[PDB]
Every structure is written in C-alpha cells, then in structure tokens.
Amino acid sequence: FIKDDYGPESRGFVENSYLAGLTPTEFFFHAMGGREGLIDTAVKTAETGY
Amino acid sequence: PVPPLSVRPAVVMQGSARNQDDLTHKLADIVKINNQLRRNEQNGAAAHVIA
Amino acid sequence: PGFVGIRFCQECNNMLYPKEDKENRILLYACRNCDYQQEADNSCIYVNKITHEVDELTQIIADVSQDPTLPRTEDHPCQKCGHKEAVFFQSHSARAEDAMRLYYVCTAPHCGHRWTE
Amino acid sequence: LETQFTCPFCNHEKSCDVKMDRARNTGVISCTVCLEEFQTPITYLSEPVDVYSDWIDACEAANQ
Amino acid sequence: DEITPDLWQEACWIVISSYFDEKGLVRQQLDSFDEFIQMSVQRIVEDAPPIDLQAPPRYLLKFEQIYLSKPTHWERDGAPSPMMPNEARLRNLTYSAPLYVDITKTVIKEGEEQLQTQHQKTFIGKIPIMLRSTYCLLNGLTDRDLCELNECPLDPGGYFIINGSEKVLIAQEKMATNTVYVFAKKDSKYAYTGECRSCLENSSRPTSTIWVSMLARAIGQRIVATLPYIKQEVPIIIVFRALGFVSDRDILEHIIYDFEDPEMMEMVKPSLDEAFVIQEQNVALNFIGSRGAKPGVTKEKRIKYAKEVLQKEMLPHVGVSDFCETKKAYFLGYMVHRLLLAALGRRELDDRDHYGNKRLDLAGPLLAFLFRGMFKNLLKEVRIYAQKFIDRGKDFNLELAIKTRIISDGLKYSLATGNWGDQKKAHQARAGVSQVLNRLTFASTLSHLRRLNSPIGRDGKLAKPRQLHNTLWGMVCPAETPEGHAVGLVKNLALMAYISVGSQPSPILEFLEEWSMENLEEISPAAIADATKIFVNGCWVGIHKDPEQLMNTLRKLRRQMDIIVSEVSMIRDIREREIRIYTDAGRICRPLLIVEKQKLLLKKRHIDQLKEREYNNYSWQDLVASGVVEYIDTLEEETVMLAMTPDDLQEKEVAYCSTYTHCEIHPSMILGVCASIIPFPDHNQSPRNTYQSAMGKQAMGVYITNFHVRMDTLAHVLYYPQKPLVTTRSMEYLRFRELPAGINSIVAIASYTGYNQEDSVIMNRSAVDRGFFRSVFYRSYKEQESKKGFDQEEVFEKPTRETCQGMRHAIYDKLDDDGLIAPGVRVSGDDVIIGKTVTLPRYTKRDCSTFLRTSETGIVDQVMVTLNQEGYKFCKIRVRSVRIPQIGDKFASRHGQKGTCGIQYRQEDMPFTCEGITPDIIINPHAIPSRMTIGHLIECLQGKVSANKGEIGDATPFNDAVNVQKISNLLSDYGYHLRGNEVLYNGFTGRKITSQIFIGPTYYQRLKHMVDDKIHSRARGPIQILNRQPMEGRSRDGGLRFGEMERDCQIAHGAAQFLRERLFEASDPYQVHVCNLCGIMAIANTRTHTYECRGCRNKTQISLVRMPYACKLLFQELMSMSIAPRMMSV
Amino acid sequence: HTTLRKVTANTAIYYDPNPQSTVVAEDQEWVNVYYEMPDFDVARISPWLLRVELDRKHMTDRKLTMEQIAEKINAGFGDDLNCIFNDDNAEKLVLRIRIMNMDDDVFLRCIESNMLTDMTLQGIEQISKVYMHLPQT
Amino acid sequence: AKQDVIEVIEKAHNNELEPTPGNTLRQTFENQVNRILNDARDKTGSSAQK
RNA sequence: AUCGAGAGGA
Ligand SMILES: [Zn+2]
Ligand SMILES: [Zn+2]
Ligand SMILES: [Zn+2]
Ligand SMILES: [Zn+2]
C-alpha cells in the first residue's frame, strides 16, 4: 500500500466472501484478527479461573 | 525438630543406590555446621568466626 | 513572539544565562563559568507555545519526494515551478496527530517546493 | 555506593561518617575511631564517595 | 521479452522451483552451522587473549588455528573410524567431530633465550555436527549414496545426533543490537528512555547495553546515561566531558545538528545546567571513576578506571581502540539526539515487535555463545594447571593441562537437555532451545526444523508480543502457531524466508570511502545538518551529501554480486536522513522480483533458462546474480513498494502507485510448511487454518523413507498413504507428494443416524476392512547391562525362578538364552522382552527385566544388539502393533475439521448413490456453518472433478483461474450435479433420502491420538511413596485427580459422603493415635496394645483418629517447622 | 476541571524595566492605561514580566472572562503576584503578571509552571472530562 | 461503501471535516469510516439472507 | 524411582 492510506482495503476490510476467497492482503489481515481471537481465548482462561 | 523418615523417604533407585530426600540432605548440612560450630564455641574461636 | 535561542560565551563557549543590571536597569547575558557579559538584543528570556502552532512545512524536507512509497498526484501543480506531479502525505507527528491535513511536495529535482491546500 | 568507609589512617572498616553541609557547600568526613577529620568543598552532584575521594587524594598529596 | 499474464502463473512457479532446488527448506540451519564452523570457532579461538604465565621463565600459549576433521568414533581399542549418522542413532553415540587447535608456546626467561615450540593439532574438544552440513559425512552424497548408507534422501538434515537422540536447535528471537530504540513506559519515572545494546561485530564479548534516559517531569527534563560497570546513573554532559568535549558548545555540536532549532536547544538545557559544576575532563573522569571500582581508590587509578570503562565498556560497536572518542561522542550524541526527537514527538517510539528491530539467533550464533563460554573455561583450567607446576618450578605438559571434556561435555549436555548455558547454572540457563526433533510425520519434521521462538515467557499475559505483527508478512507463517499457552510466541518461517547468516562489513566500508562518504572524526558538526548519516551495523561511520545516488550505487553493487553480498540490507530513511546498512546475522529476509520503471526485470529469457535448469546449470543463484531478484529484509520492506502480482504493474484507469520497486514471486509464499498443505486456505476462517497447521503435525503418514532401520521410541506409519487429489503448488517442495500423510476419502456431509454429531465422524467399516487408514505403530525399548563395578553387575540372560528374587509371575519362556526375545514373537501386555538380572551384594542375582508397556499387544519387529559409548552390551527391541481405526480414533481434514469416529457401519448399512458408491466417512453438516470452512467444501467439489477427470486439482490459495463456478461447470460435464450433491439412498431401508447429500473426495488425516493410547482405568492400584495416594499417569497405573474444582462442584451438589469418599476413602485412608491431652500424635503398639505419649507421659488417654495420610503428612511437616497442630478430640 | 494551560495559548517572560514603555508594541495601550493611576506603585514592581496569551475561544468555551482568571491568580498568590489584563475585545486575549512586592528570571518560571498546571480556574479537581448526552435507553 | 469512504477521505484531506463532540478529528474520521463499512456489511448481509 | 525440561491434547 501507499503511505497514509486509510481506505477500506488498506486497513483491513475484506470485501470478499469465504466462497469468493480472500486476496493475499485480506488473508493476512483476517489472520491478524483471528490471532486476536486465539490470544484472547488462551489468555482469559488463567485470569478467569483465578 | 527432625521429622521422621516418612516425611523424607529414602527412595530406592533401579539398583541399590538409596537416594535421600532434600530434607535429609539439608539436615545433613544443618548437622555438620551445628557440630562444627559447637566445637568452635566450646573451644576458643574468633568472635567473627563464631559469628 | 517567536522562540529564544541559547547563546554561548565567547571565551569559554558555555551557555550565557540571563541576568539583570540594576544600575542601568538593563538585561544582560552573562556566563557563570567565566566573567563575560553581553547586552541582549531580544529582551525576551523564555517562550512557551502551549498551543504549538507549528508550521509543519518547516519540518518537511524536499528529499521526501524521492520516496517510492508516497502517493503522487497530478491534480495539484507546483506554484514555484509548474511541475505537474507532486507527492502528498499527512502530518504524522505529535501535536499534529489531530487533523489529517495533507502536505504536498514537488517532485521536480532541485525545486523541492513544499505547500499545503 | 556505600556511605561508611574504611579510614585511611586507622584502617577501621566502615568507621568513617560523611556529613554533607549543602548550605555551605562543604563535606566533612570523620573517622569515629581515630577521630581524624577532613573537610572538602562539595557541589550538589557530590556524594559521600566524592568526599572520601577528596580525603584520600589530600592524604596522598600531603604524604609526598 | 516480457512475461505475459497468460504465462506468468508458471513463470513464477518455475522461479519458485529453482529457489527450492538451490536452497531447500532447512537452508537457514545448515548455513548457520556452516558459518559457525568456518568463522565463529576460529574467531572465538583467536579473540581469546594469550595466557601469559610466569613465576623467571614465562609462557604465553597462543592459540592460532583450528582444524575440524570428520566425525569419527574410537572404540575401546581406540582405532578411529568414520562414524555414520545412522550408526550414531542406533548405538546412542553423539555425531561429533574432533576439534584440534594449533598451540604455540614460546619459552622466554632472560638473555634473549627465546625458543618457540608449536604443537600442531592439539585435540581441544569434540563439536557435534549438524547433519547434511558441510562437515557431515552425508554432504554431497547422491540419493544412491544416502540409501546405501541407510539414510533417507528426503531427510532434510539440519539437526544434531546427541546420544542417539535427534536434537533440533530452535531459532531464538532477540531484540536487535547496536540500534537505538526509544520507547516510553507509561508507568515509570522516565517519560522516554533510549537504549543501545552495543556489541562489537566480531564476537569478542557479549553485548553491552547503554541506556540514555529522560528523567520524569528547575523541573525540566534531565538526561542521564546508565553506563556499564558504573554503580549509579551519570548525567550525559559529564559523560561528554569525560570524552574531552569540555565546552558546552562542543557538546551540543554532537547532540544538536541544527542550532537554529530553538526547541531541541531548550530541551537539552536542563542537562547543561545539571552538569555545570563539572567543567573539565579530569573532574568528569574523576566523577565517573568514583562510582564503580572501590570506595577508596587513588585518584590516578580512578581516572584509569573511568577511561577504561569509557573506551572499552561503553559502546563497543563504535570502537574499542584508543583515540576513538570522537566516534564515541558522535554516537552518544546521536543517542541523545534520538531521545530528544522522541521526546519532542518528531520521531516515533521504536516498536518492539517490528521484525526490522529483531534478530533470529540460529544454530550457529547459539553454538558460538556456548563455544565462547566453554573455551573461556577451558583456558582458565589450562592456566590453573600450568600455574601449580610453575609455582613448584617444574615444567608442565600442555596435553595434560587441556582437559577436553569441557568443550565436549558442555556442547553435548546443552544440546541434549536444551538448557542453554553452563551445566552448573542450570536455573539461570534458558531451556527450550535444542528440542527433540519431531519425527511423527514429514511435515512435523520440516516445521520443527523451521521453528522460531519468541522468549517472552508463556506466563506473560500481554497480548502484544503474541499478536501477528504486520511485519511478519512473507517472513513468518500467518497461520502456523500453537493454539495453547504459547500462541504467537512460537512461530514458523514462511516458505521463501531466509535468515541472513552474517557477513563482514569491511568491503562496504572500504567502498564507502571511495565514494562520496566522509569519516565522522574528519567532519565538522556543522556539516551534519543537511547531510545524511550513514550507519553500518548500527555504527555511525560517516556522512554523505547525495544519499539518493549513493543508494542507487549501493543497490546496483549488491544486485551485481559485487563487494556487497546479497543478504546485506540497505535502508534509506528519507524523512530522517539516515542510511542504515546491515550485514549482521539473524536478519530474516525474503526474495522479491525487482521492478524497472513499471516492468519486471524478469524477462522470458530468464524463464527459458530456468526451464532447462537441469541441463545448462542455470540456477536460482544466477537469477540473483542477474539483478532480477533481491533479498529484502523486514527493515528494508519499509522503504519498498510491493506489487502483489505483475497485474499491479499494469497501467490502470486510476493508477494506485505507478512507482513500484519490487513484486511478489507468489503471495502464497507467505505461508509456512504446514499451512502450505491447506487447500483453499483463503476460503477458511483463519483459526481453522491455524488448527490445521497444528494438526498436520499429528497426521500419520510415512515420516521418513528409512523407517525400517530407525529405532524410534514411537513411530506411526500409515499402510496406504495417498497424495491429495486436491493440492497446492507449494507441496511440490514440501515433498508431501513423496511422503504424504493422509488418504483421499469419499466424504459425505450428512446427518446419518446421529453418530457424527458434535465434531464426530461415521466411518465405513468395510473400507476399514480393506485397509482404509490402517497404520502400524512401532515402539522401541532400550536396555543396557551395566558393569559399573564389581559390587553389582547387570547381565542379559533368561532369568530362573530359583536364583532371581524380584521375578514377577509373568512367564519368561519367550526370551532366548541371551535374555532377548526374538523377532516375530507375539507379545501381550506385561510380557518380558529383555531378561536382565543384576548381581546381589533368589540369591546372588535379582531380576530387573524389561516388560512391555502395559496393554499394547504387538509383535516384536526386530532386535538390535550393539555396544554403547562406554561399551557394554546395549539392546534395542522394536515391537510392532497394527492399529486398525476404531470408535474414538481422531481424524481430521485439512481445514481444522477434527472429530473422533462415532461409529462404523458396513457397506450395506451406509448410504449409497445410484451407482453404488458409499462414503468412506460421513461428517455432520453442523461442523461447517459456525466454522466457515468453505475450503472443505471447495476441496470436496474440486476433488470430485479431479477424480472424474484424472487430474490433481490446484488449490493454491490466491488463484483467480480457479473459483467455485468454474469447478461446478467442470463437474456438470461428468454427469454430476454441478454443486457436488447426489441422491443417496438409505442403507437400512433403500429409500431415497429427501435431501440430496453433498459427497465427494476429501483428503483426510489419521491423527496420532488413538483412543487405545488414552483409555485408562484404576481400582486400587499402586500408590505414591511420600503421600500414600494413587500414582500419576496411565503408565504408572495411576488414579485420576479429583481436584479442587471437583471438590467445589461436589460441595455445591451437597454430596458430603461422596466428597469424603473421593477425598478420604478412595485416595489415602489412614489412622493415627492422638494424645487426648496435648493433641499430638502418640506412639501406638497394637501388637502389645501399648499406647503412650512421651510428651505428656500418659498411656491411658489416647484416641484413634481416622484422617487422610496427606493430612498426617501435613501436620508432621508443620511440626518440622515448629508449629504445633494439636488435634483436640474434645 | 480546567487549568490555565487548557485555556492558554502561549506564555513568555520578558525583561520590561518600565511598564510605561513596554517591550511589546501591541500591549502599550492598556498598560499605560493601568499605570498613570497609582492604585499599585510603579516602584514596587519588578523588572521581570510574565506575559501570557490566552486564546479567545477556549475562554468562551468555559464562558471565562479575564476577570475570573485574574481573581483566581490574585486569590491563589494574594497581592504578592500582581496581574493586569485588557478587556475581552482585543483580537488577542492577553494578560501580564509581572511580579510585584534563585533569581527572578528563575523564580518567575517556577511561578509560571505552578500557575499553569495546578491553579484551578473552574470546576472540581480530578474530574478531567465530561460528556453530556441524551440516553436513548 | 468504498466510494463513500473515499468521499470521507477527501473531506478529511481537505479539512472539510469537523470533529464531533467528545472525539478528536482522527477518532471522528475513524468512526465515520467504520460506520460506513458496518452499514455496508449489514446491507450486504441482508441481501445474502434474502 | 525422583526431579526437571520439552512437546502435545481438551
Ligand atoms: Zn563564558
Ligand atoms: Zn516545484
Ligand atoms: Zn580512622
Ligand atoms: Zn500428650
């Protein structure tokens, strides 16, 4: 991306469906979001269990 | 207070070598330095050495 | 108002600190290290811009026009030279974080004019 | 940085106490055992290690 | 000339193929180890100081040159023979080579009576050797030659064999050195703190860190520097004064490059005022010398201490020689300058997670850290041994002085245990380095060899280091990461990612002084204003006037394979006028296609030469030499404008960029080894791709071709591995086609009888009868008979009931005379495979036989006998157990869809199509919608097309030539419903199912997790010695833990007797006798019925108390602490 | 809570020996308006001047006049710290606090700092931000 | 949705965009883009549902 | 057998 690109593509809007398939940038941004979910799931457990 | 043997079991090992427990080793340390200190305080010993 | 710069002694090259001469009632700039003195031409000793009305154009440098990652535009020609293309970018600095204001730089070599719409 | 120092005169460990009189810009180091005393100028950046330093330096200089 | 779009999709993959023909997948491991052996050991040996020892005569003992021979093994006789890696695996040897060092010891006593004695090739130690490295016996061998040594040609190497165990070094993340990083801690006494972990390039010493901080909020900012070996902070201006820059102007010349800037100036001012008291170098050196050496030191020595710290200890990368203080002053002023820009907000705080800021510590540099420590310790011992002889005045023999066990045993221990450090400092050492190589399946081995690790600590609950940073793109797999407690901390290399091995900067520096560069001691600071700084490996070396054509020249040198090697990073920050050049090791980078004006440099001539790569020896490395490809590191990507595909270069109605500099070879190379297996991963939810990347490593297959000769502790081999019908173009390089880990199964996604609900599957019993997902489980048992001393000796021999004491009731008839079972003998649980008897001090020998791990029921596959390193008998027995899939075995597709077998139906019970095709597996439709694994469905449809067409489907992630419509149109040409649905008939009744079921071929995986290895039960088994409670584990016949949360649940239930049963009756019932007066456990003698408390001197008031044994143990351990827990029964 | 920094545009210290002939040219009107009338002796006044430029709109946002600010200054520091100021009509909202009875150029900075940060013109301390809205729920 | 986000991006670039109460200009732009794109996602979801 | 470490599973 160009510098200072606040457009939807650049900042992680996946304009495709799962049937259409994600583009490589959409794939990476989606992996980032899913990683957030995985970290939350793996980090909340200790602190909720305590 | 020395605890009994059940608090610090000497577990036997695949052969005959009887491994002692951490408490037993530590009581060994306390005993050796206690005996050694005892003979120093009984005898003439430097106040800083006794300390 | 404008800021005030540090000035140095001319004997030991250490900074001159302010002080006041009561028997001329005039500002002086004297060195604590040696015993040099100067008469001020400012009369202002300290300036704080809480608002920070900084012209970020001064912080830009023309060399940024060489950046392949910056966006370029043909819609804002240069007022200096008439070059047709120009790079643009945002403020991206502390106290410029507010306001997405675009700054433009001419891509003509040796012109390097900078401006803002 | 330790505040109690071995005295260069009587070699008694941690027998030297340092007093920083900042209002007069003077540090006074005194041995409790042999009662040797030394006074040096100090600055706001100075520390008891610096006063003991000036004392050791004064001793070595005077002993030349 | 130009590659057109219609050809691109194979031009690119041709390029990718060439890369993997040149490099492979474990290139980073081999290159790191090669650099370590070629350089790092010699550098470490030469960087050690000569040990000058004298009483008189004196000796220096230079070390000057190293020789690492081939790995050899010495027998008891001692004849050296070349030891082959498979022999090391079988005999539990360490695949190591001897390191010899030339030593020069010159006698100097008096009167110019000098004479040198050189000991050529003094055996200094043994270095374990990475397999397939340059110094490995498998180096350069053909596939013939490897097979003919019993080695798998597909084995990547990249690991060590220590004591027969395959150990893999995990790359360790660390925060890059010699770079200034400004951060701001929200909760601290500093608004801003800049640091540099300076480290001299040649690893003479560990990195020394300097901090230049900003005191928290006259009350103006105050800047202090935390120098090494100096007890207390120091104001920066006194550090500058200590470098001889006394005038306040001279100091600011180094700190502030433009005096016209008021705002910098006013910020610095408090520090000038704070150091106003000290005005001259000797007082500054005094002031610094006071903090550090001793409370009482003579002034001359204090000054010498402060000098020594400043030129050596502070900023070693700038320089350690004398008369460098101008360099030091400029770099220190640059650090302060950076702090000021961060404090003023002109420049952003550095990011800890940017991989431009991080370095990967690979096998080479890690072994260098060990070798540095161990060679230091060895030299210390040489000094001591020589010293006692010189004290007595007698001559000392150097061979006797050198105890080679330090290098040998240190490297062996640290690679064997993973505790990275000295064996004595077993708690300060950091574990997890050097793990046991995963040999479950080939993908697990590759991934483990490409594994990276972020040592933040799993206990840390801050998500920031665990987040997938933007800068991981192309360097680290976005998907492959453990989903447990280490999520995002353990990472994996992307496929074309290459970690730089390190290089010498001297060619670059020499070239820079040709060109328009000016040294830093040679300039006046006034020039630094509009000039551009030049850093090399962190080190501000000079300035330049036209950075643009400098960058053009340097880039075009590196693209020519001139003095600048390919792995050298060259970043031009334009807004700030720095040019940062990096040659060090640990920089992760990746190859990219260079772009002309708007045009790939890669023309059709390159693709043509690459097509005949096997004839004209035109390889990848010529592609790099042609200036068509470039390795770009994370930090240089910040200055790069990437085209995702050459279609981005194409002039558009509205041009996005129009100034691209590089292009992706293929975006699918952002994935790693295990994620490159997933078909259509861009049609799945990303957590599903992560779960598959984890589960592909538990999938069965053929983990290695030479499995028949390996005596692995555990091994699973699938009977009938199949290559997937639907594959990605990356698997051609993972060798998945050659060692696949699954079977193409006819999957129907249906609700059939309810036995596949909630992540479960219904398998075809008939297919399982035909060998579907059948596997063989190999388990190896070790044993050795130790003759450690005449007191007691073990020996393999068929025990006898009359001489052996600890003989179990199990029969030993399956053993032979030699005490070893024979191959082909069927063995059930608790059977004996090795009859070992140990001589006593049921007489004169006790049974210590090896039994099978209980409840296995295999057949002895083979028995190997040899001698271990010390050389007693050593036996390995591999037992073989056929695992037929059954209810409870875990299976998975390549899309995170895991599930156990719920039930198995025969072919007549399964639903069938009009042409009598029954599914091999039926999975529940409810596993799809929440999971959004549309890649599973697209793979099923593509696989139906592929099987009907005679293809292998292309499921490469980002491929616009393959979408669902075009697959459906293809499938409708073979007489099938275009969406993959079919009319099925109920197997039980033969009626059509009202819903048409989605059925087709999908690649499934059988995972290591079989129910027969998990089922466990206990009823009054063995107990633990300390607390008389059930053991832990299936293997120990242990009990299940009724934990605190089960106690809490049963308290909520109100089930007090059940709670007492679980926590008292079923765990550790016990009785004690308590004195009624003092409540302390008394002495009971139930045989003679005499009961007394020595404390109270009573023998009539004693009570029986029924308590848990753990509670009696607790109360006794509390008396051990002088606590009196008195059980008052009244 | 609103401190003087939140409503201040820029502060500066001058050396003004005379109030009658000020260093700055645009502040000469109201200063000579203040001084001829001897409510507050010229001799008492110190050479060192503190000039603070308030921005108009921040004053209006809290509906704050220089009168309230000057009252708060003269209350926090008593008569020890004289303050003067023009009307709320000039294009620049300015007020001058030169001291009137570690050197005064340093002292006046400590005063300036302490004024800008911890002098409370309005509101309740440790209530930083407030948002008014209509609850839809 | 993209072409609306472009509209908003030019307004912000030309200083045609004024903050809303309780937010900085960055945060208002981010709100305004996120609420364009959530409207897009909801509307496309509705279309798929129907 | 004990201790530690590591890798995994839910
Ligand atoms: Zn001076
Ligand atoms: Zn121009
Ligand atoms: Zn004394
Ligand atoms: Zn009793």
Helices (H), E92-226: 143-148
List the resolution, Å: 3.1
- Tell me which residue of E659, E657, E652, E535 sits closest to E597, measured CA to CA: E659
Q: Give the whole-angstrom CA distance, residue E179 versus residue E335.
A: 9
Cβ atoms of D26 and D14 closer than 8 Å: no
Q: Give the whole-angstrom CA distance, residue E12 versus residue E14.
A: 5
- Tell me which residue of E22, E158, E173 sits closest to E566, measured CA to CA: E22
Write down which chains contact chain G via at least 3 CB pairs under 8 A.
Answer: A, C
Across all strands, nucleotide nearest E698 (CA–C1'): H8
Which residues in chain E have Cβ-Cβ distances shorter than 8 Å to F109? 218
Contacts of B30 (CB under 8 A, 6+ apart): none
DSSP readout, E811-863?
Answer: --TTB-TTSBBPTT-EE-TT-EEE-EEE-----SBEE-PEEPPSS--EEEEEE
Hey, what amino acid is at E1077? Answer: L
Write down which chains contact chain D via at least 3 CB pairs under 8 A.
Answer: E
Length of chain B: 51
State CA E1059 to chain mean position distance.
45
Q: Give the whole-angstrom CA distance, residue E520 versus residue E433.
A: 41
If residue E62 lies in a helix (H) or strand (E), which one and from where to where?
A: strand E62-68
Q: Give the whole-angstrom CA distance, residue E340 versus residue E255.
A: 9
Contacts of E844 (CB under 8 A, 6+ apart): E803
Q: Give the whole-angstrom CA distance, residue E686 versus residue E866.
A: 50
CA distances from E107 to D12, E83, E829, G20 (A): 45, 39, 70, 86
- What are the residues whose beta carbon lies below 5 Å from ligand 4 (ion)? E 1075, 1077-1078, 1093, 1095-1096
Length of chain G: 50
Does residue D11 belong to the interface with chain E, where contact is any CB pair within 8 Å? no
Q: Give the whole-angstrom CA distance, residue F20 versus residue F31.
A: 7
Cβ–Cβ of C6/E269 closer than 8 Å?
yes
- Tell me which residue of E136, E533, E542, E121 sits closest to E341, measured CA to CA: E533
Q: Give the whole-angstrom CA distance, residue E636 versus residue E571.
A: 5
Does residue C81 belong to the interface with chain E, where contact is any CB pair within 8 Å? no
Most distant CA atoms of chain D, gap in Å: 33
Q: Searching chain A, which residue's CA lies closest to the CA of residue C64?
A: A3
Cβ atoms of E74 and E126 closer than 8 Å: no
Does residue E957 belong to the interface with chain A, where contact is any CB pair within 8 Å? yes
In angstroms, what is the C-alpha Rg of chain G? 13
Give C89-92 contacts, CB < 8 A, sequence gap 24+: C89/A3, C89/A4, C89/C64, C90/A4, C91/C56, C92/A4
Q: State the catalytic residues of E.
A: 759
Q: Give the whole-angstrom CA distance, residue E291 versus residue E287.
A: 7
DSSP state of E1061: I
Q: Could you identify the residue written with the tokens 């996120």? A: G34
- Tell me which residue of G6, C59, E659 sits closest to A5, measured CA to CA: G6
Q: Are β-strands E662-663 and E921-923 bridged in parallel, bridged antiparallel, or unpaired?
A: unpaired
Hey, what amino acid is at E1117? Answer: E
Q: Give the whole-angstrom CA distance, residue E40 versus residue E371.
A: 9
State CA E233 to chain mean position distance.
37
Q: What's the start-to-end Cα distance of chain F, in Å?
A: 28
Distance from CA(B14) to C1'(H1), angstroms, rounded: 7
Structure tokens at E462: 């801050």
Cβ within 7 Å of nucleic strand H, residues:
B 11, 13-14, 19; E 417-419, 431-432, 435-436, 438, 453, 482-484, 486, 490, 694-695, 697-698, 898, 1009, 1024-1025, 1031, 1036
Structure tokens at E936: 């599973």
Distance (angstroms) between ligand 4 centre and the Cα of E1082 equals 7
E strands present in E979-1101:
981-982, 997-1006, 1069-1075, 1083-1085, 1090-1092
Assign residue E502 a region (left: φ > 0; alpha: ψ between -120 and 50; beta: otherwise): left
Q: Give the whole-angstrom CA distance, residue F68 versus residue E747.
A: 81
Report CA dihedral (B38, B42, B45, B50) to the nearest 10 degrees.
40
3-class secondary structure, E1101: coil
DSSP readout, E405-442?
Answer: HHHHHHHHHHHHH--BS-SS-TTTSB-SSSEEPP-SSH
Q: Give the whole-angstrom CA distance, residue E745 versus residue E901.
A: 14
State CA C73 to chain mean position distance.
27
DSSP readout, E768-791?
Answer: HHTTTT-EEEEEEEEEE----BTT
- How many other CB atoms are there within 10 angstroms of residue D2's CB atom? 12
Q: Could you identify the residue written with the tokens 């397999």? A: E131
Cβ–Cβ of C98/G25 closer than 8 Å?
yes
CA distances from E205 to E51, E290, E635, F124 (A): 17, 25, 26, 58
If residue F74 lies in a helix (H) or strand (E), which one and from where to where?
A: helix F66-76
Q: Give the whole-angstrom CA distance, residue C115 versus residue C76.
A: 10
E strands present in E430-545:
435-436, 451-453, 490-492, 498-499, 518-519, 532-536, 539-544
Going along chain C from its start, the domains and CATH numbers come out as 4-48 (no CATH), 49-117 (2.20.25.10)
Q: Point out the residue among B4, B9, B16 whose CB comes nearest to the CB of E792.
A: B16
Cβ atoms of E893 and E110 closer than 8 Å: no
| Burial of E388 (C-beta count, 10 Å sphere; 0-12/13-18/19+) | exposed
Length of chain F: 137
Cβ atoms of G43 and G35 closer than 8 Å: no
Cβ atoms of E848 and B14 closer than 8 Å: yes
Q: What's the start-to-end Cα distance of chain A, in Å?
A: 44
Q: Give the whole-angstrom CA distance, residue E1047 versus residue E55.
A: 73
Q: Report yes or no on chains A and F touching (3+ CB pairs under 8 A).
A: no
- Tell me which residue of E98, E103, E128, E130 sits closest to E29, measured CA to CA: E130
Looking at chain F, the residues that come just before a C–N gap of over 2.5 A are 101
Structure tokens at E864: 């190997």
Structure tokens at E316: 């070693």
Assign residue E658 a region (left: φ > 0; alpha: ψ between -120 and 50; beta: otherwise): left
Q: Are β-strands E850-851 and E858-867 bridged in parallel, bridged antiparallel, or unpaired?
A: unpaired
CA distances from E277 to C10, D25, D42, E270, E404 (A): 19, 12, 10, 13, 56
Distance (angstroms) between ligand 4 centre and the Cα of F65 equals 85
- Tell me which residue of E1030, E468, E931, E949 sits closest to E692, measured CA to CA: E931
Which residues in chain E have Cβ-Cβ distances shorter than 8 Å to A30? 685-686
Q: Could you identify the residue written with the tokens 């997948």? A: E25
Q: Give the whole-angstrom CA distance, residue B36 versus residue D50.
A: 43
Q: Quote the Cα angle for E883-E888-E891, to 5°.
A: 75
Cβ–Cβ of C15/E248 closer than 8 Å?
yes
Q: Are β-strands E171-175 and E451-453 bridged in parallel, bridged antiparallel, or unpaired?
A: parallel
DSSP state of E50: P
Cβ–Cβ of A8/G2 closer than 8 Å?
yes
Q: Give the whole-angstrom CA distance, residue E366 versus residue E435.
A: 14
Cβ atoms of E705 and E154 closer than 8 Å: yes
Q: Are β-strands E662-663 and E898-905 bridged in parallel, bridged antiparallel, or unpaired?
A: unpaired
CA distances from F58 to C51, E349, F4, F84 (A): 11, 31, 10, 19
**F1-122 placed in CATH 3.30.1360.140:** yes
3-class secondary structure, E649: helix
- Residue numbers belonging to the annotated binding site of C: 9, 12, 31, 34, 78, 81, 106, 111
- How many other CB atoms are there within 10 angstroms of residue D32's CB atom? 14
Q: Give the whole-angstrom CA distance, residue E782 versus residue E258.
A: 73
Cβ atoms of E256 and E218 closer than 8 Å: no
- How many other CB atoms are there within 10 angstroms of residue F12's CB atom? 22
3-class secondary structure, E565: coil
E158-178 b/e (C-beta count within 10 Å ≥ 16 → b)? bbbbbbbbbbbbbbbbbebbb
Task: Give the bridge partners for E716, in sequence order.
Answer: E777
Q: Give the whole-angstrom CA distance, residue E716 versus residue E773.
A: 12
Helices (H), chain B: 22-42, 47-50
E strands present in E129-189:
160-162, 165-168, 171-175, 181-183
Distance (angstroms) between ligand 4 centre and the Cα of E362 equals 65
Structure tokens at E706: 């030479």
Distance (angstroms) between ligand 3 centre and the Cα of D26 equals 20
Q: Could you tell me how many helices (H) and strands (E) chain F has, helices first? A: 5, 6
Q: Are β-strands E1102-1108 and F48-54 bridged in parallel, bridged antiparallel, or unpaired?
A: unpaired
CA distances from E1007 to E697, E743, E774, E890 (A): 9, 12, 11, 6
Which residue lies nearest H2, CA-to-C1' measured? Answer: B11
* Residues within 8 A of A (CB atoms), E 434-463 only: 461, 463
DSSP state of F19: S
Structure tokens at E803: 């001489």
Across all strands, nucleotide nearest E417 (CA–C1'): H5
Structure tokens at E534: 């030049």
Listed by start position, the domains of chain F span 1-122
Q: List protein-proximal bases of chain H (any atom < 7 A from a CB).
A: 1-2, 4-10
Q: Give the whole-angstrom CA distance, residue B20 versus residue E929.
A: 59
In angstroms, what is the C-alpha Rg of chain B? 16
Method: cryo-EM
Q: Give the whole-angstrom CA distance, residue E410 versus residue E127.
A: 10
Cβ atoms of D10 and D34 closer than 8 Å: yes
